[PDB]
With several copies, the nearest count.
Chain A
Amino acid sequence: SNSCTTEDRREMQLMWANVWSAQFTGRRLAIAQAVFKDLFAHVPDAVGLFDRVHGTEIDSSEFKAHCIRVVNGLDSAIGLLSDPSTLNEQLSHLATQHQERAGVTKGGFSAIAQSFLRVMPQVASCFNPDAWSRCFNRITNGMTEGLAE
C-alpha cells in the first residue's frame, strides 16, 4: 500500500532530524534554497508565483525568510505526523494559505515533491525515498485539498 504508516512516520522524522539544524538557519536555508532552485529549473513559470518574496533572487533577504517559513512549515507537519488530529488542523491552515493563489496547483506540489527527492539524498544520511514520499504525499494531500490540479 501507499499509506504513510506509523513505521514510515518514524523513518521520515529520523531522516529529517538527522538533517535539521535546531539552532542555526545554515542547514535549513541550504536545503530550502536547493529545493526551490530545483523546482524553478524544472518549472520555470513557478518563479512568478514568488514575486512578493523575490523568487528571482534566491539569495535575497526576502526569499531567505520565505525559505525558512516553508521549512518551518514542513518541520511542523513532519513532527505532527505523531499527532494526526492536530496535523489535520495544521494542514488545513496551510491549505488556505496556499488557496486560490492563481498558479498554485496540485501540479506544483507534485513538482516540489520530486525536488525534495533529488535534494534530500545529497544532504541526508540513510535516506529512504520510499518512506519519505509516502508521508510527504500524505502531508501535501492535506495541503492541496481545495486546489486545482
Chain B
Amino acid sequence: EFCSEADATIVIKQWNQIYNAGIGAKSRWTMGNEIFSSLFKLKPESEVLFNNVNVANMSSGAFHAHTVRVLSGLDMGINYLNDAGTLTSLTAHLAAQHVARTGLKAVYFDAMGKVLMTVLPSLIDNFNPDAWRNCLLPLKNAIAKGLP
C-alpha cells in the first residue's frame, strides 16, 4: 500500500530539504505556525480543538511544542514510506490518538492536506505535487481513518 518506492524517494528527499535533525526548532515552529494559521483560515471551527496547548497564543512554549510534535509525526510517517508494515502501525497509532478527541472531522484532515500542498512549494525546491499527492493522501486517509 501507500505510494511507490520512486515516489517515496522524491517525497523523502524533498522533505529533508526543509526538515531534518539539523534544522533549528525556530524554523520548525515557524513552519508549524504557518501551517496551523492556514488551517484555521480554512476551517475556523477547528482552532478550538487546540485550547489545551494554548492555541490562543501561538508564540507560547506550549503551542510551539505542539507544532514540533505534529511535524515530527509527519516526519516520522514520511521517513517510513518504504516500510509499509511499520507505516501502517504508525498511522494506526496516530489515528487512535485523533479519534479519541471529540470534535475532529475527517474534512479537517482534507483541509490540512490542502494547507500542506500550498505551503510546501514555498519552501521546497522543485516541489513535486504528484509524488507528494501519491504519498501524502494514503498517509492522510490512514491517519484520518475512523473520523466522522
Interface residues of A (CB under 8 A from B): 1, 3-7, 24, 26, 81, 83-85, 87-88, 138
Q: How far is the CB of A121 from chain B (nearest CB, A)?
A: 21
The answer, among A1, A24, A26, A84, for a CB contact under 8 Å with B130, is A84
Q: How many residues of B contact A (CB 8 A)?
A: 19
The answer, among B1, B6, B121, B130, for a CB contact under 8 Å with A7, is B6
The answer to whether B134 and A5 have CB atoms under 8 Å apart is yes
| Candidate in B6, B7, B130 with the most chain A CB atoms within 10 angstroms | B130
With A5-B7, A6-B6, A6-B10 as given contacts, are A24 and B129 in contact (CB-CB < 8 Å)?
A: no
The answer to whether B129 and A3 have CB atoms under 8 Å apart is no
Chain A CB within 8 A of B101 CB: no
Chain A CB within 8 A of B3 CB: yes
The answer to whether B6 and A88 have CB atoms under 8 Å apart is no
Q: How far is the CB of A112 from chain B (nearest CB, A)?
A: 22
The answer to whether A85 and B121 have CB atoms under 8 Å apart is yes
Chain A CB within 8 A of B148 CB: no
Chain A CB within 8 A of B128 CB: yes
Q: How far is the CB of B117 from chain A (nearest CB, A)?
A: 11
Closest to A26 in B: B24
Q: Tell me the complex Cα distance, A6–B10, Å.
A: 9
List B contacts of A24 (CB < 8 A). Answer: 24, 26-27
Q: Chain B 123-142, CB within 8 Å of chain A: the 1/0 string?
A: 00011111101100010000
